Amino acid sequence: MLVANINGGFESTPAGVVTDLAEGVEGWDLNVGSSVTNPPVFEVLETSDAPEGNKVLAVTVNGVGNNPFNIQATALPVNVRPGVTYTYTIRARAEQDGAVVSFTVGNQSFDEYGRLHHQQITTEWQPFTFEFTVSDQETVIRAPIHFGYAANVGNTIYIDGLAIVDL
Numbered sequence: 556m557l558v559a560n561i562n563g564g565f566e567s568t569p570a571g572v573v574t575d576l577a578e579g580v581e582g583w584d585l586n587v588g589s590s591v592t593n594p595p596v597f598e599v600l601e602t603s604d605a606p607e608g609n610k611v612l613a614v615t616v617n618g619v620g621n622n623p624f625n626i627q628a629t630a631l632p633v634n635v636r637p638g639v640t641y642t643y644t645i646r647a648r649a650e651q652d653g654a655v656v657s658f659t660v661g662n663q664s665f666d667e668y669g670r671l672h673h674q675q676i677t678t679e680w681q682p683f684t685f686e687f688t689v690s691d692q693e694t695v696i697r698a699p700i701h702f703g704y705a706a707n708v709g710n711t712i713y714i715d716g717l718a719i720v721d722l
């Protein structure tokens with residue numbers, strides 16, 4: 556497969572809790588804003604029900620901040636070509652009912668090309684997909700996933716298999 560993003564299924568990362576948020580996970584940048592006073596736990600988990608490979612990323616939300624982007628996992632770099640249309644696909648599920656996530660893609664200037672907004676995440680793995688076009692002259696973009704929704708407090712959201720593919 557040809558994908559724009561790196562380590563989209565976390566298979567390069569050792570299992571364990573991630574505390575180097577910017578660089579602990581190849582291909583991703585994790586962020587927690589300081590308004591989040593009960594910080595989340597980001598963990599790469601080895602599990603037999605990983606949709607891809609043997610590992611997933613688990614995000615346990617113990618609290619939230621002021622905006623959903625105050626807890627994020629962002630794929631970066633994401634290598635693309637100006638004017639090309641891409642398919643985004645990812646897999647997600649949650650430990651408990653009632654989780655919400657937005658899956659977005661944007662450039663280094665934080666201009667957003669597209670998103671799937673307040674997706675309802677269930678306890679079963681589901682694919683989440685949308686198309687976007689690189690409508691400017693950027694070649695290296697990013698794919699922020701927002702987890703900091705109040706409804707997620709006390710839940711764990713699992714993601715795997717991000718693939719951004721030249722349509």
Ligand SMILES: OC[C@H]1O[C@@H](O[C@H]2[C@H](O)[C@@H](O)[C@H](O[C@H]3[C@H](O)[C@@H](O)[C@H](O)O[C@@H]3CO)O[C@@H]2CO)[C@H](O)[C@@H](O)[C@@H]1O
Nearest residue numbers: 584586587624627629631659661664665666667697699
């Ligand atoms: O690339 C990782 C960095 O992300 C920074 O947060 C950005 C979010 O990832 C992005 O979703 C958000 O996008 C804004 C957009 O700029 C605005 O036009 C639109 O109206 O709202 C979107 C969000 O709902 O931009 C922010 C940056 O302001 C982090 O701040 C950072 O820690 C991280 O490295």
Ligand SMILES: [Ca+2]
Nearest residue numbers: 564607608610
């Ligand atoms: Ca995986």
Ligand SMILES: [Ca+2]
Nearest residue numbers: 577578583584
């Ligand atoms: Ca990084």
